[PDB]
Ligand binder design. Structure first.
Ligand SMILES: [Zn+2]
Ligand SMILES: [Zn+2]
Lengths: 360, 360
């Protein structure tokens, strides 16, 4: 490939930078300290663990390249203390520091693609055994979960054990916490689950053993709220609300956290909704004048969730396994289920592995 | 008590506020919407679950008090739709919206007191069985963990099972994740544990079965860094670093996250350090010019950790159970241990419960 072959490589700027001219005619710049830190030799790097052995205390932050050789596919660098490093062209190209290359790689790692929905949702559906058996189907399943926030699996048995069977096949680890002490447990006001936790459970897997649920796309609701009621959006995305879960589950517990109901990342993108009205504390840590406008904003948020254009209604049949993003969807309803929760890290892990397996 | 008895109560500002004059001569202001939202009657509130039954859609955000009666200890309110609410004086007083009362209550819920340390640390120590048996001792144990970041328990057996025994007695739930699939598992470069997780494990419990560890107070290090090297502190508290844990543990896994090495809350206070050099990815999602100054800053951070004034050294003896804050401490060392991790929510829960039991 023209994009991935080296036409020229040289040290620049007191040898503190390496510039690559690709046959593509594209150009890339690599800091010497980063190349040294990421030497793939066996003194510096453990292949089997994919881990860096090099210590920060061994790294000269003012290092420059002493000598550089290249061909079409490799760069060969000598350091001032005679350490020697070889870098592959493809490895360098992927890790290029341009905004375009970095953003491309981030998309590949974190799967940010998102499809918003409302009442017009076609509930994504795949066969249970297909997902159990074949990488392509398991991959479709998880990528749809991440993109859409919900996927249905049909054709599981109507017997207990299917959630555990699915977990084992996927290599999932399931969460336990107060109110959900076992990995798999038997199960109108829209809510997310367990906002009293500092890190609410990411993904829920529900299996219908014996048999309406309503759901909204929280990210879609937030986007409409920001447009129609910007001040409401500002209040809900900036006000820390106390959530409190007090009870007994083999022991007495008092689980408490503060969350913004609309949780944004550094770029102002919604990453989680934290909302259960039952669990919202009587304790409200805001100046008195902030209180009534907070409730006005909450009312607008909840009005939007209850609007006909937002809500999707569905019925769970025996053998259905529904999986959903508890950070994104809110649910409610106006029954023998088995359910488990997983951390998003476990699900994203599987998504990454499966994508690699499908691509090969 | 003079502070907690009502000299006068009245509706103000179109009945949208309730003002309380305490016999103390202090004054408090309560929004009508918040009083309505927090009606303790059995239509609105579930005592046993300590949960609100009232729906957001049933709450008039523009509500005002229709009628108000009071005595020394209670307020009796009638709403415009004839709903009726009684509030206790002590309950109101505690939930007062003044900055002083709110901050007091937050301290009581979240235990923010923090004692920084270095090489001069006297390792807090309590007896294992004492902690197992008596609330006062268990309370001292957990409050010291939260304040100091580390506590040693002495006088456990030198046999396996003590971590599990301690967990059961405390009603703890233990975490599992890739690299630590069992609740209790057998176990120089300063690091925190498992930063590749979006929510790294909060608390570690280590029990020495058969027998130097070094530790630093990460919060103390950050405070010194901010003072001596403010630009380094700024870089480390604002730059998202990729952490990556790839391997096999019953299944193939690829766990990945981005963290600021120095993680601040909204008020600029350090809440977590996320740092393991082995796990820090080769992938670095920053503009090229940001790279070398990041490494310079990291080097200053690590230099500070390795300085003689920062490091505390100790040896684990058989029967020792060491507990520490994995969000705060970094550790390393230049051996038969059993270990478990817990979420801070589980530990804070126990701390709250124990404080109430000790106070009674
Ligand atoms: Zn090397
Ligand atoms: Zn009521």
């Amino acid at each position: 490939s023209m994009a991935c072959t080296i036409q020229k490589a040289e040290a620049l700027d007191g040898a503190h930078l390496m510039q690559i001219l690709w046959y593509d005619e594209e150009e890339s710049l690599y800091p010497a300290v980063w190349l040294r830190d990421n030497c793939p030799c066996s003194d510096c790097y453990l292949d089997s663990a994919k881990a860096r052995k090099l210590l920060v205390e061994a790294l000269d932050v003012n290092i420059g390249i002493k000598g550089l050789i290249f061909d079409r596919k490799k760069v060969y660098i000598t350091w001032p203390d005679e350490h020697y490093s070889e870098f592959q062209a493809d490895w360098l190209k992927k890790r290029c520091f341009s905004k375009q290359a970095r953003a491309k790689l981030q998309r590949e790692l974190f799967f940010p693609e998102c499809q918003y929905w409302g009442s017009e949702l076609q509930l994504p559906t795949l066969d249970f055994e297909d997902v159990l058996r074949y990488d392509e189907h398991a991959y479709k399943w998880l990528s749809t979960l991440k993109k859409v926030g919900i996927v249905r699996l049909t054709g599981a048995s109507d017997k207990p054990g299917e959630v555990s069977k699915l977990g084992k096949r996927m290599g999932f680890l399931y969460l336990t916490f107060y109110g959900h002490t076992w990995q798999v447990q038997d199960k109108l006001s829209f809510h997310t689950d367990y906002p009293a936790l500092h890190h609410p459970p990411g993904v829920q897997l529900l299996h219908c053993i014996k048999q309406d649920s309503e759901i909204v796309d929280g990210f879609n609701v937030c986007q409409k709220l920001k447009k129609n009621n910007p001040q409401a959006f500002q209040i809900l995305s900036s006000t820390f609300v106390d959530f409190t879960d007090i009870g007994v589950d083999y022991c007495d517990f008092s689980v408490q956290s503060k969350h913004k109901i609309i949780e944004l990342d550094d770029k102002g993108q919604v990453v989680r909704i934290n909302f259960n009205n039952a669990t919202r504390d009587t304790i409200f840590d805001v100046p008195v004048e902030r209180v009534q406008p907070f409730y006005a904003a909450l009312k607008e948020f909840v009005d939007l969730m209850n609007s006909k254009e937002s809500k999707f209604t569905f019925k769970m049949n025996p053998g259905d396994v529904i999986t959903f993003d508890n950070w994104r969807l809110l649910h409610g309803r106006r029954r023998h289920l088995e359910g488990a929760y997983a951390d998003w890290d476990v699900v994203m892990s599987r998504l990454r592995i499966l994508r690699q397996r499908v691509e090969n």
